[PDB]
Design a protein around this ligand. Structure first.
Ligand SMILES: [Mg+2]
Ligand SMILES: [Zn+2]
Lengths: 82, 25, 129, 82, 221, 102, 71, 134
RNA sequence: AGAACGAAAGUCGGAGGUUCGAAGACGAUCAGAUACCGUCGUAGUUCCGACCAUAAACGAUGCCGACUGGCGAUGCGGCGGCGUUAUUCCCAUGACCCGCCGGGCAGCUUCCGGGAAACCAAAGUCUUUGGGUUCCGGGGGGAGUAUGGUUGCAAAGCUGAAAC
RNA sequence: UUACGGCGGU
């Protein structure tokens, strides 16, 4: 974690969500890491690249994952912008 | 013995040592 | 009957960030809570915030982020010296690395690390981490 | 509902709320124009009036107060001004 | 979509409105206030059909993102949506668990139906909440084509269409099945898809075998 | 252990309801504690109806109802069996039992 | 709960010097009447003559004749 | 006392599923089938399994008992796999709608496109059944 | 510090005394019934004027302030609405229907959280501890007793130990 | 309707 000599001293850096930006633990088994597969501009077919979004399990169990992934795809290449 | 019939027997008792201590003027 | 409008301002932040929300609403302003929030803005725990200026003490909408844990207050505004500031750290900070208490000096509302560089003591105002 | 942009609302959702508790406070009142039928001056009575208001020439009833919003007795040349 | 390739395509909206799917009426969940338009004069709520179109293309993007085709655990409990699931999974090559979901299936690793997917898709949230609860433990996203009633705890790409009508449920499986194979190379995207959506509608009682073969004494007998 | 959320008595914003007296044992209970029952039983004991119509001078005579409100203490509600011992997670329901007229 | 504040230390001190009179092993060290009460009287040992040998009985689970004197 | 045990009711479902075609609705023939096809240890449960197997043989030829044998198993492919109709109930060429649901497909940019005549839901608000006990 | 109102029972004075009914009498029941049951019944209930200041006076939760989920309602106003309905043959008002706003007793649910757990949307914002401020608890007994103070017509209340 | 009791330590 960037010590005095600046070398990486940690076990591992775990994930963090993008709905409430909390730190998903090693046992938070309600936390999805989901894939959204976009298509190219011309043929509507799976060109080969996608997107990844993590949702922490506490914000899942609360009730607004669908409110979340609408909004965290809203800015990010989606259908709407409306 | 109940709590209120612990009172009544020790209310009947304290109205006696208020009277026997008053006996010896 | 609102004794300490700072403490309500920070309690409104503390409950609404653990829900994970992006925005809050602080109802009465003061010139001691706008200078409070620009301390944790220049250290980047929160971000943009508006002063919704009405003619009385206006509202404040803070765009929260999600870098924050607890932003409490010290409700007695104690005095703290510079031989005293080291005991306030290891009572209520999570570490010696990060977090800040914030004490209002005679020279302006500053951190604890900014104050010991300027080498003035003042009254403690709150803490955030 | 984690990220409702509560600084820019639709003003007919902001119309639903109290006269306090709004993003900026505003009364639910107005001044309104009243012409008695067969007279020659507009009267500009407040909407939530409280007294038995008399007119200038035609000394008769002009508006009658109630719980909230004072009732105009006769159907008059009436509109919500400014 | 963002393109014209993935747009609303007005002619198929004539299958939405020939299946209902703008029907709610009773009342609404507070986290499906976003997919509403208004209450009718009847007390009934109607649904902005571009919102259920924008999520359905978003939900079909989720299935194509799964590499293994025999992996999206497609489940249902209520009867309308049991014929639909079983040849959804025959169409796009998925894994169907129809009827009564056996509790302790996704993750109790001893018995025979120990199936561990990487995505899930539901007919109804509150009528089938037992897999919703269990998919929260193998950290596995679910997609529930939810009505204005049904709650939204363990769901992720919840489609706001309908879950109670007979023709309503079967079209939404059809419209999703047409799309998930259109993001694959199957449907040629200009020519229509040949599987007529009457195939996905819930079965009547056994008055079937009278009326269909009483219109077949000139082609068989 | 607080057994019941409302404490048997369905009052909220009061200090004192009118104490009414039980119907068979004449015991004093408050008005909203009492196990209420309202009986609209026919007076004729409807086995005994086509034994009086031969004796009736009228042909379509509407037999009168009988209107009694029984209000109980909880002690003589159980022993005379209008209420019954129940279970934990089936106490929190305020519904009456089914009717079933025949 | 607690009144608090920077200037209220008179209330917080005249609340402690009388809520200290309610725990016992302070109270039998400062109240005085429990200092006279013990026969040793703030001491550790005492001499005394023996007046009577007695045998008391043991408590509820045991049964024995414990021997004592009457100093 | 007639009620039949588990291991007889267990061993009948393993037979009659797997040998649905090698049977009949006769007790005395299916008695001889059951000894031929699986080792029964003694005579009493031989013809007591056979009785319950025949109890299903007059039965699973009528209705949907757990009868996943091939004659049932391919039969519902006349139902779910077959039966594509010639008229689509998605296509009536006329659908009747509401004045607000054409507001919904006016901002969906579709008001001038298809036929779509309306039937307005009437004056009312007589939903929400009269609440409480009577 | 200080005052006010305080159920019942109670005490004092005067009216009144139907009913119920401490005490009491008597009959039953019982080994024994000074208890349950039965009958008669005094003080009391009932009003008036003076006193007493206690109750499981219980939401067993001091008051004030904020923030933090949802839904269906019920009560009071206020605003706006398809309509049916009232004299209404039209108006303006009442009734019902759909909402929204504020305040009130509340309710159903939930993994916001909390808790020893029952459970509580406050008993939550608490080892990530600090929004005011009041009273009060420190193992159980001895004890709400002893003494003193004061109050009271009396009963008793308030203040309240220690030996052991 | 009546229906009370059960020596001390394991
Ligand atoms: Mg008692
Ligand atoms: Zn009774």
């Amino acid at each position: 974690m960037q010590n005095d000599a600046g070398e990486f001293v940690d076990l591992y850096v775990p994930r963090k969500c993008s709905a409430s930006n909390r730190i998903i633990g090693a046992k938070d088994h309600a936390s999805i890491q989901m894939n959204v597969a976009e298509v190219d501009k011309v043929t509507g077919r799976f060109n080969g690249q996608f997107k990844t979004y993590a949702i922490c399990g506490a914000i899942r169990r609360m009730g607004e994952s669908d409110d979340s992934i609408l909004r965290l795809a809203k800015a990010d290449g989606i259908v709407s912008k409306n | 013995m109940r709590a209120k019939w612990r009172k009544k027997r020790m209310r009947r008792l304290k109205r006696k040592r208020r009277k026997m201590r008053q006996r010896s003027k | 009957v609102r004794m300490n409008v700072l403490a309500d301002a920070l309690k409104s932040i503390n409950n609404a960030e653990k829900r994970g929300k992006r925005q809050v609403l602080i109802r009465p302003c003061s010139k001691v809570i706008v200078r409070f929030l620009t301390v944790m803005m220049k250290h980047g725990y929160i971000g943009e915030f508006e002063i919704i200026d009405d003619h009385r003490a206006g509202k404040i909408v803070v765009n929260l982020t999600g870098r924050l844990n607890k932003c409490g207050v010290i409700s007695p505004r104690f005095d703290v010296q510079l031989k005293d500031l080291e005991k306030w750290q290891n009572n209520l900070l999570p570490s010696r690395q990060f977090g800040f208490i914030v004490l209002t000096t005679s020279a302006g509302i500053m951190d604890h690390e900014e104050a010991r560089r300027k080498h003035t003591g003042g009254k403690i105002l709150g803490f955030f981490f | 509902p984690l990220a409702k942009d509560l600084l820019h609302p639709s003003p007919e959702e902001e119309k639903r709320k109290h006269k306090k508790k709004r993003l900026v406070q505003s009364p639910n009142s107005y001044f309104m124009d009243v012409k008695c039928p067969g007279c020659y001056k507009i009267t500009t009575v407040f909407s939530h009036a409280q007294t038995v208001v008399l007119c200038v020439g035609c000394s008769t009833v002009l508006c009658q107060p109630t719980g909230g919003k004072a009732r105009l007795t006769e159907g008059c040349s009436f509109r919500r001004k400014q | 979509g963002a393109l014209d390739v993935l747009q609303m395509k007005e002619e198929d909206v004539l299958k939405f409105l020939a299946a209902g799917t703008h029907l709610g009426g009773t009342n609404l969940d507070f986290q499906m206030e976003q997919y509403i338009y208004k209450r009718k004069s009847d007390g009934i709520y109607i649904i902005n059909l571009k919102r259920t179109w924008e999520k359905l293309l978003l939900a079909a993007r989720a299935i194509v993102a799964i590499e293994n085709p025999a992996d999206v655990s497609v489940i249902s409990s209520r009867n309308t949506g049991q014929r639909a699931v079983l040849k959804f999974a025959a169409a796009t090559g998925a894994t169907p668990i129809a009827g009564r979901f056996t509790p302790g299936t996704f993750t109790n690793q001893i018995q025979a139906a120990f199936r561990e997917p990487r995505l899930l898709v539901v007919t109804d949230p509150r009528a089938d909440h037992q897999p919703l609860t269990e998919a929260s433990y193998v950290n596995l996203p679910t997609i529930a084509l939810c009505n204005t009633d049904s709650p939204l705890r363990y769901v992720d790409i919840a489609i706001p269409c309908n879950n109670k009508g007979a023709h309503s449920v079967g079209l939404m499986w059809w419209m999703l099945a047409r799309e998930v194979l259109r993001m694959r190379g199957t449907i040629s995207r200009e020519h229509p898809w040949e599987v007529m959506p009457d195939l996905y509608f819930y079965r009547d009682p056994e008055e079937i075998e009278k009326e269909e073969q009483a219109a077949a004494e000139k082609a068989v007998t | 252990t607080k057994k019941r959320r409302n404490n048997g008595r369905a009052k909220k914003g009061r200090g004192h309801v009118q104490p009414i007296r039980c119907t068979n044992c004449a015991r004093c209970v408050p008005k909203d504690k009492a196990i209420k029952k309202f009986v609209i039983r026919n007076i004729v004991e409807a086995a005994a109806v086509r034994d009086i119509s031969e004796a009736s001078v009228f042909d379509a005579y509407v037999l009168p109802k009988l209107y009694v409100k029984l209000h109980y203490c909880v002690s003589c509600a159980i022993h005379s069996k209008v209420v019954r011992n129940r279970s934990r997670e089936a106490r929190k329901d305020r519904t009456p039992p089914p009717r079933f007229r025949p | 709960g607690k009144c608090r504040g920077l200037r209220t230390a008179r209330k917080l001190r005249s609340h402690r010097r009388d809520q200290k009179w309610h725990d016992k092993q302070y109270k039998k060290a400062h109240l005085g009447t429990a200092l006279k009460a013990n026969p040793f009287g703030g001491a550790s040992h005492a001499k005394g003559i023996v007046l009577e040998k007695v045998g008391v009985e043991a408590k509820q689970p045991n049964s024995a004749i414990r021997k004592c004197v009457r100093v | 006392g007639r009620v039949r045990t588990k291991t007889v009711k267990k061993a009948a479902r393993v037979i009659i599923e797997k040998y649905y075609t090698r049977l009949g609705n006769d007790f005395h023939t299916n008695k001889r089938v059951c000894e031929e096809i699986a080792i029964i240890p003694s005579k009493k449960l031989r013809n007591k399994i056979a009785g319950y197997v025949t109890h299903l043989m007059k039965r699973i030829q009528r209705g949907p008992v757990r009868g996943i044998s091939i004659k049932l198993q391919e039969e519902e492919r006349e139902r779910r796999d077959n039966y594509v109709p010639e008229v689509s109930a998605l296509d009536q060429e006329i659908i009747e709608v509401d004045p607000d649901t054409k507001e919904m497909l006016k901002l969906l940019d579709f008001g001038s496109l298809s036929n779509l005549q309306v039937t307005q839901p009437t004056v009312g608000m007589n939903f929400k059944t009269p609440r409480g006990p009577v």
